């Protein structure tokens, strides 16, 4: 019994890009949600299926923590029943999502003068990503009917595109650190409660 790992997810030095999103499993710890409250910095605290004021009286078998870095003007895509470049190729949440998603600002924690081109996202994909799936590939997208082998030219494009975060940049186009805590419940007995 110890305080849960919700101290490094929100305070890590390096954050993951959208396509290669890192996932943490949290189990066998006493839930300490007090850090989320009275923070005055979380610019988006939305919960789906469970209220945020009733988090301390609920039993959760497994808690999954997922972390991305997306553009400010597309945080709204992270929700059940939403469509877009992110919610259809990069990340996906099922229509019965049971968790809380949080996102704050990192205007000067990830941005550097001249542009931090580290963060990338999927721009081309054939189909719709299945929920809670991470498809990672470098295979070059074939837009036309002619098979393409390795070369990059017409009708043959790279799947990943980099962001352009900068110091003097608009609020909607500024980087955001977004965390998802899916409070999934399993038919197996709830080993951990509270």
């Amino acid at each position, epitope marked *: 019994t110890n305080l849960c790992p919700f101290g490094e997810v929100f305070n890590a030095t390096r954050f993951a890009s959208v396509y290669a999103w890192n996932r943490k499993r949290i189990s066998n710890c006493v839930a300490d949600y007090s850090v989320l409250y009275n923070s005055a910095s979380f610019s988006t605290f939305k919960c789906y299926g469970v209220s945020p004021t009733k988090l301390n009286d609920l039993c959760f078998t497994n808690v999954y923590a997922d972390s991305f870095v997306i553009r400010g003007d597309e945080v709204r895509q992270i929700a059940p029943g939403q469509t877009g470049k992110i919610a*259809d190729y990069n990340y996906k949440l099922p229509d019965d999502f049971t968790g809380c998603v949080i996102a704050w600002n990192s205007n000067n924690l990830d941005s550097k003068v001249g542009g931090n081109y580290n963060y990338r996202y999927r721009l081309f994909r*054939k189909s719709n990503l299945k929920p809670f799936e991470r498809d990672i590939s470098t295979e070059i997208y074939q837009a*036309g009917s002619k098979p393409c082998n390795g070369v990059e030219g017409f009708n043959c494009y790279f799947p990943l595109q980099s962001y352009g975060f900068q110091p003097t940049n608009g609020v909607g186009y500024q980087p955001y650190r977004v965390v998802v805590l899916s409070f999934e419940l399993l038919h197996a007995p709830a080993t951990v409660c509270g």
Partner: antibody, heavy 115, light 107 residues
Framework: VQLVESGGGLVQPGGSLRLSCAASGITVSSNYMNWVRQAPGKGLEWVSLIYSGGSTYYADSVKGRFTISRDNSKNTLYLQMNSLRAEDTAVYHC???????????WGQGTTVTVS | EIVLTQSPGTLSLSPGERATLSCRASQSVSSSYLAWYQQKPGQAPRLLIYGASSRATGIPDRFSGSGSGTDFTLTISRLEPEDFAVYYCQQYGSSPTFGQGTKLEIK
């Protein structure tokens, strides 16, 4: 590569019409496809956009009225226009969108007149 | 949500000179989504520049864009009889947004 449009004609106000844009050299079912219209005396204007995954996006002035669909077998992109109004008279071009690289393949367009 | 205004509305020049066409945005927007376009009368538009300074494939070397932030500029080194048409600047938020169009005319 070519984009050939069809289905244009004269339709009385309040009626229905069905435009088609057959494509050769680029797959309709694997790229972002755009419908952009050109009213006379005015510049271009976005109408709709369909993702490779089936997502649909429409402009504010055409919400609920227009429907965009595609069929893989005939490799033809459509646009269904119901509840037509007099302000929809323009030339409709189909384009293939690369977002970062812009739209580089266009069609000569189909002409729609309502009166 | 993004309104792009290009100034001037109609620029009158002569062949060989250097053109200065601009596209000003209401809010600062990433330069990796700005594409200039050209359209001659009775014709489908042609892609000139994508991003901010990259010539599209098959495009001559006269066109050379520049700028970042809110103010952009399209520059033609020497005007030719084939470079007098309507120019558009396209942006990309959640969906494409187009400008009002600028037409080049002979002095």
């Amino acid at each position: 590569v070519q984009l050939v449009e069809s289905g244009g004609g004269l339709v009385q106000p309040g009626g229905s019409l069905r435009l088609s844009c057959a494509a050769s050299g680029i797959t309709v079912s694997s790229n972002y496809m755009n419908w952009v219209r050109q009213a006379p005396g005015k510049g271009l204007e976005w109408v709709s956009l369909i993702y490779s995954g089936g997502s649909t996006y429409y402009a504010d002035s055409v919400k609920g009225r227009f429907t965009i669909s595609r069929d893989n077998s005939k490799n033809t992109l459509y646009l269904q226009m119901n509840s037509l109004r007099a302000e929809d008279t323009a030339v409709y071009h189909c384009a293939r969108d690369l977002v970062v690289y812009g739209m580089d393949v266009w069609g000569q367009g189909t002409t729609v007149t309502v009166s | 949500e993004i309104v792009l205004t290009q100034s001037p509305g109609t620029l009158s020049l002569s062949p060989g000179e250097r053109a200065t066409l601009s596209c000003r945005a209401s809010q600062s927007v990433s330069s990796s989504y700005l594409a200039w376009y050209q359209q001659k009368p009775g014709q489908a538009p042609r892609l000139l520049i994508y991003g901010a300074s990259s010539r599209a494939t098959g495009i001559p070397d006269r066109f050379s864009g520049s700028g970042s932030g809110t103010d952009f500029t399209l520059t033609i080194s020497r005007l030719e009889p084939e470079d007098f048409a309507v120019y558009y600047c396209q942006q990309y938020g959640s969906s494409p947004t187009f400008g009002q169009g600028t037409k080049l005319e002979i002095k």
